[PDB]
Amino acid sequence: MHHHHHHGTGSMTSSADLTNLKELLSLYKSLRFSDSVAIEKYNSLVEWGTSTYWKIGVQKVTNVETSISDYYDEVKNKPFNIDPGYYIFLPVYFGSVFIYSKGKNMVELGSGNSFQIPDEIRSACNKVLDSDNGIDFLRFVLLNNRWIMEDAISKYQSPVNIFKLASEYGLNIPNYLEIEIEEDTLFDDELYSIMERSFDDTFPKISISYIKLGELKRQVVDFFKFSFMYIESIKVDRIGDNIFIPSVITKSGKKILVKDVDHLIRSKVREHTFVKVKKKNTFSILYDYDGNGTETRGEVIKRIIDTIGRDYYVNGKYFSKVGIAGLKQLTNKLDINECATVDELVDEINKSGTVKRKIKNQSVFDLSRECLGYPEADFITLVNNMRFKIENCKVVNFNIENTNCLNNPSIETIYGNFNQFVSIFNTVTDVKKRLFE
Amino acid sequence: SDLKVATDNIVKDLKKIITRISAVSTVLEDVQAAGISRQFTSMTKAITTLSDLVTEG
Amino acid sequence: RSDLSDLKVATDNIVKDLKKIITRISAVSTVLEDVQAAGISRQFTSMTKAITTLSDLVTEGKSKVVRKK
Amino acid sequence: SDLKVATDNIVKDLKKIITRISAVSTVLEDVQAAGISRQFTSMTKAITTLSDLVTEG
Amino acid sequence: LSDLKVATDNIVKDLKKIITRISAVSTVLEDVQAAGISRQFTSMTKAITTLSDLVTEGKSKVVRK
Amino acid sequence: MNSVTISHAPYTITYHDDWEPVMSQLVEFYNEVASWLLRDETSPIPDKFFIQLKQPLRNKRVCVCGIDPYPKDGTGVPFESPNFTKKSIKEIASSISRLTGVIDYKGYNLNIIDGVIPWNYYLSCKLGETKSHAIYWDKISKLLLQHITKHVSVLYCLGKTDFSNIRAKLESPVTTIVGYHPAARDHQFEKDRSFEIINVLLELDNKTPINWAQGFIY
Amino acid sequence: MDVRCINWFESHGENRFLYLKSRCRNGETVFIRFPHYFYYVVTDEIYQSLSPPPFNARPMGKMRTIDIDETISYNLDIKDRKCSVADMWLIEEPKKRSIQNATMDEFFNISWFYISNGISPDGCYSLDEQYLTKINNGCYHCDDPRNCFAKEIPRFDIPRSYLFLDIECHFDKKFPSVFINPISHTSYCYIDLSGKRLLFTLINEEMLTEQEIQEAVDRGCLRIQSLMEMDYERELVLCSEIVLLRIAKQLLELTFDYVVTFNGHNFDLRYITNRLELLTGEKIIFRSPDKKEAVHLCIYERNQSSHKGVCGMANTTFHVNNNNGTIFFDLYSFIQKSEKLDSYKLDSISKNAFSCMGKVLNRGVREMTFIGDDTTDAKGKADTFAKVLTTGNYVTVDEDIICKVIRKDILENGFKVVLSCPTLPNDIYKLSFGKDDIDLAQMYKDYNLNIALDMARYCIHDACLCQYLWEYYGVETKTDAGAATYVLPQSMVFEYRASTIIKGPLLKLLLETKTILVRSETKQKFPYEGGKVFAPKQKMFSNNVLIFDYNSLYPNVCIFGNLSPETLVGVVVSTNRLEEEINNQLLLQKYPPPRYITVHCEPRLPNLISEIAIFDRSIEGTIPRLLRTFLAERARYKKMLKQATSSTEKAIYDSMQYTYKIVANSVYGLMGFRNSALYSYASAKSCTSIGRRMILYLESVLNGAELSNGMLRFANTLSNPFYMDDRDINPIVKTSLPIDYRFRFRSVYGDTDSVFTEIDSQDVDKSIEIAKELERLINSRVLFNNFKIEFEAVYKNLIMQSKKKYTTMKYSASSNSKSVPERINKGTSETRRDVSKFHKNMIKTYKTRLSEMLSEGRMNSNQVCIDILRSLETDLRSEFDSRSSPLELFMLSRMHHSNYKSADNPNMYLVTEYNKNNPETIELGERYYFAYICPANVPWTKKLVNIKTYETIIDRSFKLGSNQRIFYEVYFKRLTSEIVNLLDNKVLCISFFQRMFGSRPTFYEA
DNA sequence: GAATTAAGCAATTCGTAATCATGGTCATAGCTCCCGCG
DNA sequence: CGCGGGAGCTATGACCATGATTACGAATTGC
Ligand SMILES: Cc1cn([C@H]2CC[C@@H](COP(=O)(O)OP(=O)(O)OP(=O)(O)O)O2)c(=O)[nH]c1=O
Ligand SMILES: [Mg+2]
């Protein structure tokens, strides 16, 4: 009524509404760069703006093609002439490109999925982001489970000083060649080899990107030749406590590097066949492409697991193995001293308050899954098709109900390792009962 | 039995051709895969004419 | 095998090999028509088995490269 | 015993062809005569290649 | 038969099939030579010789002059 | 810059070409209400009821909407005071001075800003009375404000009670900001930060922000 | 000082006064003023830390403050819900005060005035005059409402005054404009404080010639020149329009208890004040009871947005800016909110309301003499019809032909009416007050004295028809119970939706139970499952179907499970079956099944696979106590419904108990509603989950249940679906039925709480008494705690199109074999408002034909389909060519709103094009008539595209042009579609649907 | 001048629009033979 | 005798028109 307005209107003109609108604008300017949490926050702010004002210029997004090509351009395989000036040279690495935007997460390029990172690297990323707020995102590279901070694209500040600051926080860093060319120089391949050896890295450097001080939208430079050589076999190489990298082997003996297991599947490579490969002077880079096989993704994974070994399974970007999971793997996951008994284990966690708080924060199932190094979705799919007998939060008997998930080789391999999962799960359950009850 | 050993040599040579297709077909571009697909359609229509010849007589 | 670059020339080479085998089976068909018109009695059960197995081989070699997207 | 009866039927069809050409050959006229002559030169080129393939061993 | 157009047409048309079958015999002979089986071509050589004699009689008969 | 003829005391309406789809309906509505409207001594004179129709609408992206002219000394342009004695334009100038830092000004004018059309919903009122001519200007106000919100990106309304139903007076959705009146008690227009909200909502629509310092009169 | 509260109302000025309009036993209207405060509830530490002291602060006692925030837990270490027990204070200031962490701010100051002072708004009070200070004559000031309103005497009757008015305005166009078109007639039903019901119509003498004025004076109509000459006792008074408007101003300025109109705030009163401001400059001045402030009548919009979708504006109501205490009541808005009808124009409401069956005594050439009494229709139907017929002029017979009343006679127990009707063959006919067979604009063109007196009669019929709709809908009793129950002012009762009318008794119980509900985290909405709707097992039912329905299912669920936002212990979710089974085991050992109910729900998120909500039943929740209050109100009005004799009183109390039922279902729905203060996603989700288990349990006992030798055997045991209880679970249950009865029961349909139990018998009486035994035995052995079912009806010839779409003959529990059954349509084409009258009539005709062809049983179903589709083709071609059915048979209805996800929606564009092109405007929430109109030269169109572009809004002044026609193919396609869902032989149906409408028909799948 | 509302979901039908199956057509790459000039 | 120009044919991928499927909102109603 006239004590209650012609229509109920909220406080649409407050400083909180202005802050929400400015946050909505900032998330709109970084829609292609953000994690799914910031996309959902953007959609919540769009819904608030459409409820608050009758229309807004921005709309809800359902799927976003996560690409960072706004600050890049067309890569040229041909030699070209440089412009004079002061330049900032960067190496481009082989591994999967990740971005650490203002959404505080590690965002995978081409999928937009937030990827789980170690706590020290995440803490260094928060220190870098809280040091200066002008940075749009941190271009990260994941190769052989090594988080190196390739680039720090900032809107207002020059990227030279942030790199040593990140190296102070324990972030892995590349070497830099900040030389004023000041003349027209043609990038021959011999100069490219000089530049790559002047980067002084044994890590696989696949392209070179240069930054101008007075110019944004930096350009990546790649010289290569497309090749097709014969593949003898696909082998694995140990890069961690449990994870393995894929690496196809030629008939001659050259090792073509594979980006991830997803790169191995997506190229649809099998033995005794040719591959679409980029050729470099130092090493070999398999090109990123979608293979033209008639088999599906699951059949490709079946053939790959049947080739490299039955005890390997697809664990995110890497192959993880099956072995005996005792107390030493639990102490390796908990990053503490090795213990032989449950008593020494709970005493050691009683010594370390940070590990004890970590055990509080995440549940028994998550601790037992991360100790075994299982993937999240595949293990959830496996356990959601099994049956359990529980006595005092312990698995005294397990049996699978639906065997249709066993067609996945990863799920079948983890079902083979499920006895060790039961052992680790009961051990972690006993640790939780003894420490906090 | 000249036709028998002739078709046996055809089977062996085409086995070599199909394993080379299996070697190169994952990484083919669209236009050359289109060309080899027209070649395989000519393959199929020629063999169905051969099957009609050996069926009707 | 070994190392190759610019695989379109190898594609042209194996297209030429398919041209050779297409002319070969056309030769077989055009002499088979003549030997059937000659009036000789022939038993082609094993021949029919050979054509059936070769057609299955052709289908198996085709099915990897038929459809895009 | 298929190639010999095949070429026997071929040479019988060519016997019929040569007899009908000799029947109609009281007049031929120049351009069609040059056409069948150049087809005959291509045919005897094929015959010469076949003779090379049977004498190479 | 008037104006000899149809006669010339259907003797040109048959010669294409004849040279196709001749190249067919050559190709299947290449196939059975590359298969690795041992064959003898004595009666084939006799047929080639008498076919060559009759077709060079045809060469002597075909000329318009 | 077309013109039409009406039967009552303005006797003509000079209007921009962007006002063309709503003029004949405005002519018939004003012809039916004007003989009752013009008995009262209106707060702008009848010759300046339709000054804002001379303004174009394609270049405007922001509508600054009041419910009526000032009860006295209305000049036909909304929120315009040559004497600069009106309270509403004084608090508007105070808010813009707090936004931009321009404190050395003689007056303010929302008409001289690019992309901003100042609007009165009801185009007149009786002298000394607020919303007294809503009776006469209801249909015209609805028609002309939907015509504005077809063109502008952001509609800004200066009254909580006056424009609570402005989402019902319009039917096509536009970016609507129902703000506090400048003469509201407890200084809610002093705590109002709506011009920044206008600029941010323009940047959300990929539009040029309003440089609010263009309205200052030195 | 004995008063009865009529209306409560706040001062419009800045100095906030709360007023009571009250009436004593002698008939004196007494006004009581109160200082209206802004009420805030703070803790004791906040109260003593207030640097400005409160004007008034009262101790509310030690009340617990519970954080109602729903946190899911992946383990069973749920932290206890944050209960902060503290002394709380009721802070009162005359000005609004922003207090940090002030709780219970969702309630209004008026509800806080009522409940903290113990005042019932529908209450009779002996006021202590030592707390009353007299301001002027009739108005008192009460500084202390606690002790003055302390003696609550029982209710006594008061002489309420009323002003029912309708006006008639001239119009050359389709609609009057207040600037050019005058008011022709203003009719009034004046009801004085002495009970004197005065009926008078003021006729504008400016629209009549002077000879016609003198002729009406000779006929007896009074000529007046001012207000002093005006007599309310004269039935017909002539005046100028200025004198007419000053009489309207004088009447509306009177302190009536109710000024009631139909569409009068939007049109009649607004036209009165606009024309009064135009012609003479005066304003209708409402003054305060203490006369400190005086406001003018300005009709203000109140626009409701929807709470679903994009939350666009969905409804607008119009109200009077009045502060004298008169409840200016628009019946149009009230019946819009309360009823669900095709049209909300006054003729449609009068047709649906005042319908009576009347038999014929005399037949003539042009006159038909109907009589109606307690034998022709139900008791009170004919008395209501006679009351409407006292001022009525036109009666519609069988809802299609309009007959003028020639002579009228009001009997003792009914009516006697002579109607200008063609001779009709049947003995009884439905008499209703529907459409009028006049064209008002044409009568305004050739306006003479006889047309003026006829329109004065129609105007006084409309003004008294406001009174007849006021008494028919029982707005007096509904207003009183809304003041008592919802704890609201009487003018504020109907003009608020669920949340507001919850906020009163919820505040009452929150003060009673010393419970405070607060929120810290953001409320998040997820989609949750609703009631479980079983598929119909059969398309036809030749057997009797017993209907068992839970008595207030979702309220009884929430009371049974103690489903409240604060009694939720926690929500336990699991992403995997290992953690699900571990949480299941520690759930059974941790929470005892008697004290805690663990409700298994579907997950709110895709990664979760289980979701169990635990509710503590040790302390009764706020939502269960609110539901107990509303089911107490519904039970007492159901008891008043069973004790009601007249049909109008039965309709009133049925609407009253249905209103309390919907309010209880809204206590449910507000926990599913994210913007509500009582939002508990776990509680609403658990309520649907428990109700789903209740329908599965009642189905499992009833499906496959057989009766044998007087022993009732269910298919499954009588186990509680949630835990083990002390009652017997044995399905073998002793009846009170004879041994020889051996029948089988099977469930064939279910819908949320209803289960459709098909008994193999066909006798009505035997099925009713066995179903009564089933209801008694289910309520005694099958059901538990507050769960009760009742047996409503036996469904003979139950024709079910789909889920929620059925047609049946109702044999109620109080009915028998010899009692006539009523035809219940539920969701079929006859009930849906987007279905035309031609569509409804043809579905009824062809359903009767299909029932005849299935009851004959002598020919195959394919021949039945052939003959029905041939008759359908003949009828459709005859309607397409002859076009004998008028536009009225094809008028579809739709409500106008702005709640559209697309700004370019065709419906809203159609209404805005209508509002641009026409003087009549369609408001938000208005139901308008639209029809598919195409040019008449267009032939039978096979493929139907751009169908919404052919929609034309039909109003009362719309005439179908010669160049235009009804686009028959759309209605025919929908009609043929529902018939081919009725029929078998699907291939022939596809073939006929392709040869008429060029498309594949959609068939329902069982 | 401001002042805060606002029940849930299930299920069916109907119109509209995006998506896809089927089919017709249209450039287009083989493709293969005829004609011709050196 | 041998290879280029040309022209009819023959599929063949690509593109577009038309109709059937399905998601998707709206309206409505059962609850
Ligand atoms: C009608 C309606 C119902 N509900 C819910 C709430 C309960 C169930 C069953 O209610 P029903 O009317 O069948 O019977 P019910 O009211 O439960 O019991 P009665 O037979 O009316 O006593 O549906 C609702 O949420 N909103 C509504 O408008
Ligand atoms: Mg019920």
A70 lies in some domain: no
How many Å apart are G418 CA and H23 C1'?
70
Count CB atoms within 10 A of the CB of residue F6.
16
Q: Which of A226, A252, A292 lies nearest to residue C5, judging by beta carbons?
A: A226
Footprint of strand I on the protein (CB under 7 A): B 30, 34, 37-38, 41-42, 45; C 68; D 38, 41, 45; G 309, 340, 530-531, 751-754, 804-805, 825-827, 831-834, 893-895, 897, 899-902, 905, 907, 927, 943, 999-1000
CA distance G474 to G467: 10
In chain E, the largest separation of any two C-alpha atoms, in whole Å, equals 53
Beta bridge partners of G887: none
- Locate G20 and state its tokens: 């009571």
Q: Phi and psi (nearest 5°) for G302? A: -130, 110
* Ligand nearest to the Cα of G804, by number: 1
Instruction: Write the CB contacts of B3 (distance below 8 Å, at least 6 apart in sequence).
Output: C28, C32, C47, D2, E28
CA distance C11 to G799: 69
Q: How far is CA F32 from the centre of its chain?
A: 23
Going through G714-827 in order, the beta strands assigned E by DSSP cover 732-734, 744-751, 754-759, 789-802, 805-812, 822-826
G893 with G929: CB under 8 angstroms? yes
Alpha-carbon separation of residue A363 from A116, A369, A432, C41, G576 (angstroms): 16, 10, 9, 82, 12
Q: Which amino acid is residue G702, in one-letter code?
A: L
CA distance G276 to G24: 35
A76 lies in some domain: no
Give G192-209 as a DSSP string: -TT--EEEEEEEEGGGS-
Q: Which residue has the tokens 């109620």?
A: G812
In a 3-state reduction of DSSP, which class is residue G164? strand
Range of the domain at A302: 225-320
Hey, which chains touch C, using 3+ CB pairs under 8 Å? A, B, D, E
Q: Which helix (H) or strand (E) holds G439?
A: none
Q: Which residue has the tokens 């055009």?
A: C30
Alpha-carbon separation of residue B21 from A293, C14, C55, C61, F96 (angstroms): 11, 8, 16, 7, 74
Spatial CA neighbour of G869 closest among G1005, G722, G792, G977: G977
Same structural domain, A216 and A91: yes
Protein-contacted bases of chain I (C-beta within 7 A):
1-2, 11-14, 19-21, 25-31
Q: Which nucleotide is nearest to G676 (CA to C1')?
A: H6
Secondary structure of chain A in the HEC alphabet? CCCCCCCCCCCCCCHHHHHHHHHHHHHHHCCCCCCHHHHHHHHHHHHHHHHHCCCCCCCCCCCCCCCCCCCCCCCECCCCECCCCEEEEEEEECCEEEEEECCCCEEECCCCCEECCCHHHHHHHHHHHHHCCCEEEEEEEECCCCEEEEEEEECCCCCHHHHHHHHHCCCECCCCECCECCCCCECCHHHHHHHHHHHCCCCCEEEEEEEECCCCCCEEECCCEEEEEEEEEEEEEECCCCEEEEEEEECCCCEEECCCHHHHHHCCCCCCCECCEEECCCCEEECCCCCCCCCCHHHHHHHHHHHHCCCCEEECCEEECCCCCCHHHHHHHHCCCCCCCHHHHHHHHHHCHHHHHHHHHCCHHHHHHHHHCCCHHHHHHHHCCEEEEECCCCEEEEEECCCHHHHCHHHHHHHHCHHHHHHHHHHHHHHHHHHHC
Domain coordinates in residue numbering, chain F? 3-218
G888 with G837: CB under 8 angstroms? yes
In chain C, the largest separation of any two C-alpha atoms, in whole Å, equals 53
**In this structure, CATH architecture of domain G837-997:** Orthogonal Bundle (1.10)
CA distance G76 to G584: 9
Regarding beta strands F154-158 and F62-66, do their DSSP bridges make them parallel or antiparallel, or are they unpaired?
parallel
Tell me the structure's resolution in angstroms, rounded to a single decimal: 2.7
How does DSSP classify residue G643?
T
Q: Do A225 and C65 touch (CB under 8 A)?
A: no
| Nearest protein residue by Cα to C1' of nucleotide H16 | G946
Q: What is the dihedral of CA A217, A223, A228, A232, to 10 degrees?
A: -90
The residue from A268, A285, A320 where one domain ends is A320
* Ligand nearest to the Cα of G631, by number: 1
Indicate if ligand 1 lies below 6 Å from the C-beta of G6.
no
CA of G693 relative to ligand 2 center, distance in Å: 15
Give G331-359 as a DSSP string: HHHHHHHH---S--SHHHHHHHHSEEEEE
Indicate if ligand 1 lies below 6 Å from the C-beta of G700.
no
Same structural domain, A292 and A213: no
Give G99-137 as a DSSP string: -TT-B-TTS-HHHHHHHHTT--SS-EEE--GGGEEEEET
Work out which ligand 1 atom sits closest to the CA atom of G753. Answer: 9
Q: Phi and psi (nearest 5°) for F158? A: -100, 70
Spatial CA neighbour of A24 closest among A40, A46, A39: A46
Terminal CA-to-CA distance of chain F, rounded, Å? Answer: 30
How does DSSP classify residue F126?
B
A79 lies in some domain: no
Q: What is the dihedral of CA G853, G858, G862, G863, to 10 degrees?
A: -80
Terminal CA-to-CA distance of chain B, rounded, Å? Answer: 18
Q: Where in chain G is the domain with CATH 3.30.420.10?
A: 162-338
Residues of C in contact with A294 (CB under 8 A): 63-64, 66
Active site residues per annotation of F: 68
Query: How many domains does chain A contain in total?
Result: 4
Count CB atoms within 10 A of the CB of residue G63.
21
- Does the beta carbon of B18 lie under 8 angstroms from any beta carbon of chain A? no
CA distance G496 to F155: 30
Protein-contacted bases of chain H (C-beta within 7 A):
1-16, 29-31, 33-36
**CATH fold of the domain at G545-826:** Palm domain of DNA polymerase (3.90.1600)
How many Å apart are G330 CA and H7 C1'?
24
- Locate A377 and state its tokens: 């979705």
Q: Which amino acid is residue A291, in one-letter code?
A: G
Q: Show the DSSP H helices in G731-836 as ranges.
A: 764-777
CA distance G268 to G185: 11
Indicate if ligand 1 lies below 6 Å from the C-beta of G40.
no
Indicate if ligand 1 lies below 6 Å from the C-beta of G549.
yes
Does the domain at residues G355-432 carry the CATH identifier 2.40.30?
yes
Q: Which helix (H) or strand (E) holds G369?
A: strand G367-372
SS3 content of chain E, % helix, strand, coil (to 5): 80, 0, 20
Dihedral sign from CA coordinates of G114, G117, G123, G125: negative
Distance from CA of G106 to the nearest CA of A (A): 14
CATH number of G162-338: 3.30.420.10
